[PDB]
Amino acid sequence: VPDYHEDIHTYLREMEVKCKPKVGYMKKQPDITNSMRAILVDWLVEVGEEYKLQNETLHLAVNYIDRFLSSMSVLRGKLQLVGTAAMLLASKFEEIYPPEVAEFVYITDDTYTKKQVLRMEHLVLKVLTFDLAAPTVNQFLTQYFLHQQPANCKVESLAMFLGELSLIDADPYLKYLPSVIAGAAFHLALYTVTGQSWPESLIRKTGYTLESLKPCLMDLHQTYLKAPQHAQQSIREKYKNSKYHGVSLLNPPETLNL
């Protein structure tokens, strides 16, 4: 409904800077790693599938985790609890029908009690000072999709896929803002399917160019090439389904010609 499309995009651009997690945070965690984070996010993706949650809900939850972990040191035995509550909070924000608390307890295989989940919910709301309305890669892609001429469902679904893969690896994707990752993923998807490129219309909207996008784009391209070998595979599996036009089956381009 382009009467607020511009204002909204500007606003998200400002808010993504303020809601950004701290890039180096895992260095300062004594007992957890990037690779343990990779396992958490991958499981959250399955969780999202299991309960048919929105992708947006998945992106938010990750954002909540990364922000929470930017200031709170957490023991590995507790990382899955942080994640669970994060996903519950995201579900409550974003979902018409969030899963009820028991369900969240259940998908951990009764690892934590209902009381723990609810306490961690409260702790997370505190540490985040209730600031839950964070921009995601998903929110940017969705706007960028309006610039397709014409609309192509494979590109959309593929861009989603890629943006989703970026959630798994804090190194390097924590360095990049949602809007830039979305840019990269959009370009990469469009090029893979149609041969077309980041359109002039988005240069005007975003002020990003292939040049500004290159660093993230180089990374994301590697990630896309190496995706079948990645220790975490839930996202590839998820995007095999028809609902997403089987885009995880498409072959990545061997070169980007940049």
Binding site: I32, I39, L40, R76, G77, L79, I107, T108, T111
Partner: peptide, 9 residues
């Protein structure tokens, strides 16, 4: 199964 306890070893 997605109902796993995560074992971070």
């Amino acid at each position: 199964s997605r109902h796993k306890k995560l074992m971070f070893k």
